[PDB]
Amino acid sequence: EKRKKERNLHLQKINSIIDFIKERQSEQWSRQERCFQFGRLGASLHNQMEKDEQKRIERTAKQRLAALK
Amino acid sequence: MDPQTLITKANKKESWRYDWYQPSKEKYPFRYKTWLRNQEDEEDILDLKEFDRR
């Protein structure tokens, strides 16, 4: 009757709060994982830019003989 | 051109307000300022190349 409804409400207020706090813990892990992964991708972009531009510096150094003629 | 029609032509839709809100379960006795979704019925141009570092 009323006691079954009250115990069902207590069990739901326990379980739903535990489930949403576990979902927010999963969000707290996922945000730090996204920050780490995109920070490492941004770090790899600097290596890509160095490999793109140091070759250009070497080509402009190799064209110095043609500039000296 | 006109500064309104330049923004209208460029970059191509709902609105949001910062208003009091009273939640429901029925109605709670409190209100709080939050960003609510708006309903349907709810100048000069500076010339460039002047501050250019040359």
Next chain:
Amino acid sequence: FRQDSILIIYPRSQTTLVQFGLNEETFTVPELEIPTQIYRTTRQDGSYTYHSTNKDNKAELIKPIQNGEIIDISAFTQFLRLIFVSILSDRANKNQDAFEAELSNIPLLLITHHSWSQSDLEIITQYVFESLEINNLIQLPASLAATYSMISLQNCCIIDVGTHHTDIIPIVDYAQLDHLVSSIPMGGQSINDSLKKLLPQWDDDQIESLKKSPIFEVLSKNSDLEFNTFWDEKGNEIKVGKQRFQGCNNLIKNISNRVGLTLDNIDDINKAKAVWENIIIVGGTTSISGFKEALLGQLLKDHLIIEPEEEKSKREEEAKSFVPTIEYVQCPTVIKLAKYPDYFPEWKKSGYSEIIFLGAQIVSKQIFTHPKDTFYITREKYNMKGPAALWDVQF
């Protein structure tokens, strides 16, 4: 997206760096430096309008940002509109069909400050997606841009030496600890006002020209000569003695004490050592040579973990009768500066005082050239949550 359609705005308390579009070959210096100011015209019935010039001597000059803080968000948003409409007019006058290719979808990257209010950032989030109608927006932290222009180290400290203030922000695990963000009201004007006390006979323009002189360095050839002659703004030659080697010491001691009191509160030692090993010094005053090396030397004088010499000499006198090293467990064992990127041709010539703006162009190549829409608010996200979607795309 289209790399010619990228707009980046870096506002400060004095000026604002503006650039629309990338060069697509190398990263270059920004050509537009607009002074951060607005003109409020007092219209009758209580309406407010904002202009670019003084409208018939009826407008008041309002600076929206002072000491890194916004005092008028309605002035700051209309100043962003005053920049954006002028860029639209320039593109429409130069290209005459840019509204389908270069202006059809502009991803805006606005660089924000740490002392700006979250309510003000949500007003900006409202304003960009309602009034400016801009489809994509990143509110980028400047402190994180200062280390994203670097080799992207995980743990560091950012020292932003401004004109009237100096900001100290630690960065741990690619995250900004807001509880240790500090700001002293001592900047380049401290270096000026110290020269007011050292040489009272000079005035504001001569002391500013001494601060902007190439012979103004701090020891940590100019040094062997006692008197050297620099030039004034009007073209007058002025001699100066040893005072050009002074004037920065109070600011360097204040920045060192505040960085020490900031970074000695970090409890984790393995995450705290990499912050002391990666000191990054940014700002407009930091184009003065020797300032960063003098600040590094003051940090090695004050907060370096080293055995004291008055005990090490007694240890050596007891040993002269191999010397073991006293091993401490306190975290600032190594204090070094971060490696500056020495591969940018335009930024090597124009200096690295505006490296936060380069960090914006690098994170724009990260985000705006990829279809991942988890770090910028789209129209679909703005129609669902709006400003509440602002803190779901943050770092």
Next chain:
Amino acid sequence: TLNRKCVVIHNGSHRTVAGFSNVELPQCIIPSSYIKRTEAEFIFGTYNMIDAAAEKRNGDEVYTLVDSQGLPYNWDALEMQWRYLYDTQLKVSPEELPLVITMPATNGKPDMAILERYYELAFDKLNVPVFQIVIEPLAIALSMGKSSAFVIDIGASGCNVTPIIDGIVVKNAVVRSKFGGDFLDFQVHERLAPLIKEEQKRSTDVWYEASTWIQQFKSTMLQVSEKDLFELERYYKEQADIYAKQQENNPLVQKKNFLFKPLNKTLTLDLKECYQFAEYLFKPQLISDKFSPEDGLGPLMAKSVKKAGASSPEQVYSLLLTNVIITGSTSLIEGMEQRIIKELSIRFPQYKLTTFANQVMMDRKIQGWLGALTMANLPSWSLGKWYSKEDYETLKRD
């Protein structure tokens, strides 16, 4: 979720952590005290506190706000603290956003008076429309993903021991201890006094020394032994004899060095004297004869469980011993987990101990902040008791 944004302020014993509900990192972590500069000036903050303590001007008096019972007592200074927070750190009006604050675990009697003071502080002074009061060990146990747990919070004002069953707090087994971080800040200053050439109104220099280098001494130099201190001398030598017999040393002879910055001096302390500070939290009879060993945390671990069993007792015992959560800002010293595990296992050999604890160094100090952060973002208003203005309008009537 709900379209809302809340403000979470955790009033700790030594560190007050204020921030918002939309973020996971706090906006500010200030100390829980103030400086009365003498006109009167209530200095608050984080760095201004340290600067005003380092200037060492006359009249600067550092006054505490949270006693050993966890309850505030200087309400005008707490009002000035929150007016400093919402203007300089939070930068938002308190009328616009809701609030979630915490409550320390009591026995039931001082709850209504602090409820009335929170009503008078949030309604007639800040005009907050609604605020939630959560229980701090319940918040710590519930943010970890548990409904029934056994919370051990090693704080500055003492140790907080709280048995929790099925979401409710067993109040009559809640015994608040005294020996904590404020005790260690006195013991370090008392023991190192002939080595640094030194040895309320004059509490400013004491708090400055406890906040600059004694905290670094706790975070770097100190280590906690997992066993009783004489049993270390019984056990480590017994292991070293087996190692020496298998192959063909005293672990306490390892000299650890502290760099004292106001004099720049190397302080050499061995591992036995490093463990001597950690043994004070569990054996209080080593400094005087008026402190019984029941006053320590060691027998209190069994005493609180035996008092919570009489809220049939063995089911409560097996429910509390398998959900022990170790937390606290001063519990970050290495060995606080293992010492509690061993000291609880030597009095309960039958039941296995499965202790879960947040190993994050930054998040264990703000664990009481995160416990209210998980409560502030709940998608239903009926999941927590949101005290509104009507709850005080009905308290005005008798």
